[PDB]
Short mmCIF file of C-alpha atoms and ligand atoms in Angstrom, two decimals:
data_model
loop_
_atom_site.label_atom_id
_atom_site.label_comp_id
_atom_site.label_asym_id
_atom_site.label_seq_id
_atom_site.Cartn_x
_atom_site.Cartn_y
_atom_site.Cartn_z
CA UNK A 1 40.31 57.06 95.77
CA UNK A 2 42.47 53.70 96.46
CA UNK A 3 41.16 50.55 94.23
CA UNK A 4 39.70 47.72 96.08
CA UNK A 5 43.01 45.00 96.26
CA UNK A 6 41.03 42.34 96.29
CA UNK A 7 38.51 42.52 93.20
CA UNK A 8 38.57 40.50 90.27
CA UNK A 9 39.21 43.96 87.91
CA UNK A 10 41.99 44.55 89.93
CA UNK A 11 43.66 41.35 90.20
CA UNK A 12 43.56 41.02 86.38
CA UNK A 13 45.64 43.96 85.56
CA UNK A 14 47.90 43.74 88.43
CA UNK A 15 48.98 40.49 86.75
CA UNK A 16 49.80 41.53 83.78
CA UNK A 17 51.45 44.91 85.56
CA UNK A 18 53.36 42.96 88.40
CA UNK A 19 54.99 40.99 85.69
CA UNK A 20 56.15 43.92 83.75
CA UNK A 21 57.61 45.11 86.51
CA UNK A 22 59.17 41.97 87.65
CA UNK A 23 60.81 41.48 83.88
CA UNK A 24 61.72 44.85 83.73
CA UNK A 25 63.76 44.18 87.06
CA UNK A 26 65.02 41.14 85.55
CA UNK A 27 65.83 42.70 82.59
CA UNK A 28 67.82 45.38 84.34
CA UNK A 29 69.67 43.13 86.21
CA UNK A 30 71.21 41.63 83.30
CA UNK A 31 71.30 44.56 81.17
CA UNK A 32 73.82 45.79 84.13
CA UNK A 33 75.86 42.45 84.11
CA UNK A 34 75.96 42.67 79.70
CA UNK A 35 77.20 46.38 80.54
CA UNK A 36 80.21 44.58 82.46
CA UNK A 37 81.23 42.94 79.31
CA UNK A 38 81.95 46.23 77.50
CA UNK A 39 83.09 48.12 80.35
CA UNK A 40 85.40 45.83 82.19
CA UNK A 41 86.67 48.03 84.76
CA UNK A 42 83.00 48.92 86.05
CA UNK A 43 82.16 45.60 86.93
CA UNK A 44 82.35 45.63 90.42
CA UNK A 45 80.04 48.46 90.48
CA UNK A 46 77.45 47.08 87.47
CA UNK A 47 77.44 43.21 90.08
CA UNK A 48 76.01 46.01 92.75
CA UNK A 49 73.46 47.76 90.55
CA UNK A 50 72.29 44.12 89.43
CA UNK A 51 72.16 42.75 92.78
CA UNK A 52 70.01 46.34 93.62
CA UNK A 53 67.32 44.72 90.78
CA UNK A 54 67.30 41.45 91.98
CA UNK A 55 66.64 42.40 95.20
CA UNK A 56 63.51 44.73 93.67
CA UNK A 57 62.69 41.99 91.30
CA UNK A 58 62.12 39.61 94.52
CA UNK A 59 59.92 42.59 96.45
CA UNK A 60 58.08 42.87 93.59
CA UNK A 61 57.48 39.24 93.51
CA UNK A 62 56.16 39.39 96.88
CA UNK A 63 53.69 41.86 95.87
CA UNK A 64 51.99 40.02 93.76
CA UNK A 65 52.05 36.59 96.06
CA UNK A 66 50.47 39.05 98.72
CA UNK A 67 47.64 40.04 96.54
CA UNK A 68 46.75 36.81 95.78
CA UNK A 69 47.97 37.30 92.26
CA UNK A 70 49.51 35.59 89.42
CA UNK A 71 51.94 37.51 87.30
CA UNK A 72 51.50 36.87 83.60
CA UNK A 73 55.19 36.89 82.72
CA UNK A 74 54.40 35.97 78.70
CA UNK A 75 52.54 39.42 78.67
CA UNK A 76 55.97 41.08 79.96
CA UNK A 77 58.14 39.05 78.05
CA UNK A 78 56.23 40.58 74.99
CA UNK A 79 56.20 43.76 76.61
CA UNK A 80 59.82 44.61 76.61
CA UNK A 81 60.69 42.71 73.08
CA UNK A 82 61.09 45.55 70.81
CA UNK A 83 63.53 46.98 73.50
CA UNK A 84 64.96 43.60 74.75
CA UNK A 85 65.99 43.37 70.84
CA UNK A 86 67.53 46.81 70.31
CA UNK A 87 69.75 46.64 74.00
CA UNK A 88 70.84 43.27 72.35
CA UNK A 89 71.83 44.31 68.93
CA UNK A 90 73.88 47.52 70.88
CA UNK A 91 75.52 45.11 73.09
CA UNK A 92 76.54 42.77 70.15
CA UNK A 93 78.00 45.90 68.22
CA UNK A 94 79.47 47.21 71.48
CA UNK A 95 77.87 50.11 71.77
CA UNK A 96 77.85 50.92 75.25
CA UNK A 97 76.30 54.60 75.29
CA UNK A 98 73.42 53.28 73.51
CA UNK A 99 73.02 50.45 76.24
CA UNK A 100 73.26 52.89 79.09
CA UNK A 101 70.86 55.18 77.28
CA UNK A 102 68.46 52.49 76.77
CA UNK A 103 68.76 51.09 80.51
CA UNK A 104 70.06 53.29 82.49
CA UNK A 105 68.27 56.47 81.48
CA UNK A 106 65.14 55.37 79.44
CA UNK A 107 63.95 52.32 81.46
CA UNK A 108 65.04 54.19 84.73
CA UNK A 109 63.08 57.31 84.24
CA UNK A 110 59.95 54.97 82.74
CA UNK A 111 60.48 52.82 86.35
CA UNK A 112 61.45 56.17 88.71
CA UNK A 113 57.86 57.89 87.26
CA UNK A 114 56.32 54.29 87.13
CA UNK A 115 56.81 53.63 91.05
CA UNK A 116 56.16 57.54 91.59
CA UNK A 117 52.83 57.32 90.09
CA UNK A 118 51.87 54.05 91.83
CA UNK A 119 53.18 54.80 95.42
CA UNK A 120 49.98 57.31 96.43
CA UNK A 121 47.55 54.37 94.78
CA UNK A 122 49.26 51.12 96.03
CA UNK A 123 48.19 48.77 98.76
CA UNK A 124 50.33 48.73 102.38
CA UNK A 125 52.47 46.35 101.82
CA UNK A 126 53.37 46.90 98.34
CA UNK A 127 53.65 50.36 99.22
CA UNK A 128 57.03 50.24 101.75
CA UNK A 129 58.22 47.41 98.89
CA UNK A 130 57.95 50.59 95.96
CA UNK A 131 59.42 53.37 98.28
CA UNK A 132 62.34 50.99 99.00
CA UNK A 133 62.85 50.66 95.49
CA UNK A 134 62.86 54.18 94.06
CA UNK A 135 66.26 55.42 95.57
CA UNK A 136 67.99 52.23 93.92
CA UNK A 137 66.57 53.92 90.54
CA UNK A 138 67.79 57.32 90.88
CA UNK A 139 71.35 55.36 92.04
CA UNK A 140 71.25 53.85 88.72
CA UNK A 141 70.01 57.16 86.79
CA UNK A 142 73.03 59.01 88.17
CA UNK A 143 75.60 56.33 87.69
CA UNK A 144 74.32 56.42 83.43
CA UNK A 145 74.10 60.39 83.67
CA UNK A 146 77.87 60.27 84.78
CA UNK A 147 79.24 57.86 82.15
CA UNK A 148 77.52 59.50 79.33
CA UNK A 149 78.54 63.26 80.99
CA UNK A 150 82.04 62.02 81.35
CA UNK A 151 81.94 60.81 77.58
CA UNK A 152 79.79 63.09 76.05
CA UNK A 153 82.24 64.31 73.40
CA UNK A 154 83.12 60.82 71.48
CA UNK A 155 79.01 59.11 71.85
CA UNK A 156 76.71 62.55 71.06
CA UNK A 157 75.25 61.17 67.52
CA UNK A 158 75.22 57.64 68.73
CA UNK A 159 73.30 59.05 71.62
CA UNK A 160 70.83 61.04 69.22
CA UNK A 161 70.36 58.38 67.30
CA UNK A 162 69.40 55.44 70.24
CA UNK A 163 66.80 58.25 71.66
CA UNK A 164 65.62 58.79 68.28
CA UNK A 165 65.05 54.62 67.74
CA UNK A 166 64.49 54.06 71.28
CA UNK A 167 62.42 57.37 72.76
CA UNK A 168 59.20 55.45 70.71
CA UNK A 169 59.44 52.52 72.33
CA UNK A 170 59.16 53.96 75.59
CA UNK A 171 55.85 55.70 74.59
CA UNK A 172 54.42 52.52 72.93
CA UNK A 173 55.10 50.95 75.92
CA UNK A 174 53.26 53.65 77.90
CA UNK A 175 50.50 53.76 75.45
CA UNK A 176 50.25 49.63 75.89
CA UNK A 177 50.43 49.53 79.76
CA UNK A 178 47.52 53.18 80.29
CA UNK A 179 44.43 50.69 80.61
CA UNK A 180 46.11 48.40 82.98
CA UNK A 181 47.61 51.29 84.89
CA UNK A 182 44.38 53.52 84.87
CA UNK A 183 42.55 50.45 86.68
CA UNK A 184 45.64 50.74 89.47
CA UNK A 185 44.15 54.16 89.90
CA UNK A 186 47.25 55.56 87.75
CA UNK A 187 47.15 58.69 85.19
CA UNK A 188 48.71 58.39 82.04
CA UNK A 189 49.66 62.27 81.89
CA UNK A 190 51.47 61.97 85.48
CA UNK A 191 53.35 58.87 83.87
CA UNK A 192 54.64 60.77 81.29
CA UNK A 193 55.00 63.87 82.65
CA UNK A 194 56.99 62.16 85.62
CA UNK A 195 59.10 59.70 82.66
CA UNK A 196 60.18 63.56 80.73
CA UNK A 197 61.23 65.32 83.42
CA UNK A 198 63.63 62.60 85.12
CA UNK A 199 64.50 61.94 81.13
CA UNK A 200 65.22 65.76 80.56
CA UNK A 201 66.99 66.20 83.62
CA UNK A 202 69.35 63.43 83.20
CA UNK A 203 69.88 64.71 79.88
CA UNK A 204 70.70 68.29 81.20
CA UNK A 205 72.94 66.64 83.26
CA UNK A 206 74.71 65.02 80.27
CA UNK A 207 75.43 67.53 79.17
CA UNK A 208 72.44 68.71 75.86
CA UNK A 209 71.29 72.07 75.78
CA UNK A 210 67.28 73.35 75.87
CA UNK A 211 67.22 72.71 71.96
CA UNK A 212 68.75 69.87 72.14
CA UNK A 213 66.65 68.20 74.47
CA UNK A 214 63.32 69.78 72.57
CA UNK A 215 64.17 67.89 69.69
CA UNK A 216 64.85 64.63 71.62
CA UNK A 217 61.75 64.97 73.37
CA UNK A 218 60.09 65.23 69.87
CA UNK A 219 61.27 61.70 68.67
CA UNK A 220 58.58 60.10 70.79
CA UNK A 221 56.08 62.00 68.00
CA UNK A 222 57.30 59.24 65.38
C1 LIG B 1 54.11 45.49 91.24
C2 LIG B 1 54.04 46.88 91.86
C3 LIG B 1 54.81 47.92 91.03
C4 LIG B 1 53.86 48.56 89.99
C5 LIG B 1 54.44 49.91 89.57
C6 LIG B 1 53.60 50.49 88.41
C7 LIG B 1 54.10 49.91 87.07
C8 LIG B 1 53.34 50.55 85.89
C9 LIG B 1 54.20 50.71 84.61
C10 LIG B 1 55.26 49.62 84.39
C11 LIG B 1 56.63 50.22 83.98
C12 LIG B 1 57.75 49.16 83.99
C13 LIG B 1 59.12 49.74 84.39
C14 LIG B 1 60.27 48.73 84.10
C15 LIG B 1 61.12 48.40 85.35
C16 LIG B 1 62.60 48.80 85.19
C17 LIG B 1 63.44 48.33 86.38
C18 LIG B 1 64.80 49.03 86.57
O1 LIG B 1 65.46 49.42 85.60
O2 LIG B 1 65.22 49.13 87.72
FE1 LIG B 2 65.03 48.26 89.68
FE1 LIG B 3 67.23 50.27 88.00
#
């Protein structure tokens, strides 16, 4: 059954969920831009998937404003540190297949099953706000999927390696944001089932095979 918008128990963990969502847009946009830096022929095409998370980053905004909600943007800030830091310390070393992995396949398969999940639970207004969200995502999915298919060859233990430091992140972040999400009416087990399958079909896409895949799945056990 939908939550009531307007209680208190709501409005408390929509705060601190609205402003994970709002840094993670944030976030995205300027992982996109940083991506620019390292590939300096895609930048007309990262300025477009960066303007795409602005413009969610502003519609997610308004979803909080419209519930009468203030986002607690410290709580997000914390949130993403631990994978702020590691996009950072790829992007200093130049290593651009582990900032697409972490952005563009990671955080876009944790948002795609993220905005999946909430979209059946979610109030009217932030409801047409998500759904005009989620094809942007799988834009940005696809456009990662095709670097890292077209490059496969030369980045294949770099990419091991950033799911393998990067894969547990993702599920301590999912283990941090399940109480908050279960009061939104979310289940944990369609997050992550949702978050693997986009991840393992992106990955098929790249190019892995079944085994693989099975033992990149199994780094989020560490
Ligand atoms: C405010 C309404 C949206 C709420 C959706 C449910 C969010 C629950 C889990 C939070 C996951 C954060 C995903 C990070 C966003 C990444 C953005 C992107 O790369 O485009
Ligand atoms: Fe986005
Ligand atoms: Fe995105």
């Amino acid at each position: 059954a939908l939550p009531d918008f307007t209680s208190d128990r709501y409005k408390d963990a929509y705060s601190r969920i609205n402003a994970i969502v709002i840094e993670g847009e944030q976030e995205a946009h300027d992982n996109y831009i940083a991506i620019g830096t390292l590939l300096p022929d895609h930048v007309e095409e990262l300025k477009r998937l960066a303007k795409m998370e602005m413009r969610h980053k502003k519609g997610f905004t308004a979803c909080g404003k419209n519930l009468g909600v203030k986002a607690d943007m410290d709580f997000a800030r914390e949130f993403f540190a631990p994978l702020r830091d590691n996009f950072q310390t790829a992007l200093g070393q130049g290593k651009t297949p582990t900032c697409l992995l972490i952005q563009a396949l990671l955080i876009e398969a944790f948002a795609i099953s993220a905005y999946h999940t909430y979209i059946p639970v979610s109030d009217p207004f932030a409801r047409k706000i998500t759904e005009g969200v989620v094809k942007d995502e799988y834009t940005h999915l696809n456009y990662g999927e095709a670097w890292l298919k077209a490059n496969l060859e030369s980045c294949r233990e770099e990419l091991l390696e950033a799911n393998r430091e990067n894969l547990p992140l993702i599920r301590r972040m999912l283990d941090q944001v399940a109480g908050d999400a279960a009061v939104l009416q979310m289940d944990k087990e369609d997050l992550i089932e949702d978050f693997l399958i986009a991840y393992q079909e992106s990955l098929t896409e790249i190019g892995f095979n079944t085994r693989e895949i099975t033992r990149m799945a199994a780094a989020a056990l560490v």
